[PDB]
Amino acid sequence: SMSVKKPKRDDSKDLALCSMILTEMETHEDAWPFLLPVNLKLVPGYKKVIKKPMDFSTIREKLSSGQYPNLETFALDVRLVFDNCETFNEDDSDIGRAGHNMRKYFEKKWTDTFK
Structure with a gap:
């Protein structure tokens, strides 16, 4: 609360680490349905x-x-x-x-990296 803070968890590497995880997800062989936005003109529904x-x-x-x-x-x-x-x-x-x-895959990298 006001003037009462929990200890500072170091977040300074978070950006780099999320980028690494994302790179691993992008390069997974099963990433192909997810690499680009679904074409809303071509996919009914x-x-x-x-x-x-x-x-x-x-x-x-x-x-x-x-x-x-x-x-x-x-x-x-x-x-x-x-x-x-x-x-x-x-x-x-x-x-x-x-x-x-x-x-x-993601949830394991997430736990291993941050938890």
Whole structure:
């Protein structure tokens, strides 16, 4: 509260570390459904159904331009990618399986890096 602060957790490497994680996600073989924004002109239903589209390119641009105020808003966008994937794709489809795998991959790097 006012003039009463918890000890300073060192956040000075967060930007670099989120960039590294993102690089690892970008280079994973199952990243292909997630690398670019879904083409809303060519994919029926996507626009109306998925209220907040998100993809790795968009996260990378946001990261590169200071649009994440902290590492939690970064994780929120990554998880949005997989949440959207689960919303639109059957679990037993290549894209659906890709999304479960990438989520697992991410969540391990996240825990290992920060927790």
